[PDB]
Amino acid sequence: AISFDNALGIHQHTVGVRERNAEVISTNIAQANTPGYKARGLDFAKELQAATSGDKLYRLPTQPDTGDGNTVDLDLERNLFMQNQIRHQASLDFLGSKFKNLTKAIKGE
Template identity: 70%
Template sequence: MAISFDKALGIHQYTVGVRERNAELIATNIAQADTPGYKAKGMDFQKALQAASSGASISLDLTNGRHIPASKTVAGEVLYRTPTQPDTGDGNTVDVDLERNLFMQNQLRHQASLDFLGGKFKGLTKAIKGE
C-alpha cells in the first residue's frame, strides 16, 4: 500500500516553507531599520498557507522565443505593514521591537512545525519497519 504524504504530514509540511518566507521578510525589515524611506513588509500567514497548500503557482511571461519557460510556487503576497509608531522624519516604518517579537514568535512556531514533522516521520519509519 502506498503512503500518502499529504495525508500523513498534513498542513505542517506547508507551514515550514511559509514560516521560512515570513522569517526572511522580518529579517529584511530588521536589517533595513535604519534605511531612510524603507517600508516594513509582512505577509498574511493564512492566505500564504492556503496558497502553498493548494499548489498555486505563477508562470513567467516569455518575451523572447529563446527564453526558458518557468513557474514559481506562490509563497504568499508580500504586503506593506501598517506603521505602529510615529514617523521619525525619514519615512522608515520599521518598528524594531515589533519586528523582533514577530521574528521570535515566528521562529517558535517554525520549530514547533519542524518538531511535529519529525514526530510524523518517526511514526512513519516505525510503521515501515513494522515496530
Template identity: 70%
Template structure:
C-alpha cells in the same frame, strides 16, 4: 499499500516553507531599519498557507535566452505594515521591537512545525519497520 505523504504529514509540510519565507521578510525589515524611506512589509500567513496548499505557482521571467526557465510556489502577497510608531522624519516605518517579537514568534512556530514533522516521520519509520 502506498503511503500518501499529503495525508501522513498534514499541513505541517507547507507551514515550514511559509514560515521560512515569513522569517526572510521580517529579517529584511530588521536589516533595513535604518534605511530612510524603507516601508516595513509583512505577509498574511493564512493567505500564504492557502496558496502553498493549493499548489499554485507562477513562472519567473527570463532576462536572457540562455537562462533556465523556472517556476516557484506562491508564498503570499506582501503588504505594507501599518506604522505603530510616529514618523521620525526619514520615512522609515520599521519598528524594530515589533519586528524582533514577530521574528521570535515565527521561529517558535516554525520549530513546532519541524517537531511535528519529525514525530510524523518517526512514526512512519516505526510503521514501516513493523514496530
C-alpha cells in the same frame, strides 16, 4: 489513502511559510535604518493557502516617522521574529514526528 500528503498533513507547507516569514522579518530588521523603506508584512493564512495549492501587505506604523520615512518598528520586529522561530521549531517537530511514525509503522520497530 497511504500517501505522503495524507500522512504529513499541513506540517510540510507550514515549515516553508515560517521560513518565508523569517526572511521577511529579517529584511525589516536589516532595512530598519534605511530611510523611505516601508515595513513588509506577511499573511500566514493566505501564504499557507497558496502553498497548499500552487498581494504586498504593509504594516501600519504605531507612531509617525522622524522624517526619514521608515515605518519599521524594531521593537515589534524582534517580538515577531522570536514568535516565528518558536512556531517554526514546533512545525519541524510536528513534521519530523510524521516521518518517524511512518517509518515506525512500515518497520514495526
